[PDB]
Amino acid sequence: LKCNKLVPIAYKTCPEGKNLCYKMFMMSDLTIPVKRGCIDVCPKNSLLVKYVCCNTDRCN
């Protein structure tokens, strides 16, 4: 799938054993995220940073 970088302006495809995109938010997810990348499986959600996975292009 095609995932975006920090800003939802630049994004590409994540073939490297990746078919999902994720975004990590600080404290809360409601607010803007802090980092994001591609992944094959949703990682463990932390209490410090909120984990949000998706399978849609430009989801992050």
Q: Contact 33/3 with Cβ under 8 angstroms? A: no
Tokens representing residue 2 in the block: 């095609």
* Experimental technique behind these coordinates: NMR
Residue 28 near residue 37, CB atoms below 8 Å: no
What are the structural domains of the chain?
Answer: 1-60 (2.10.60.10)
What 3-state DSSP class applies to 52?
strand
Interacting residues of 55 by C-beta distance below 8 A, sequence separation 6+: 1, 19, 20, 21
Cα end-to-end span (Å), the chain: 11
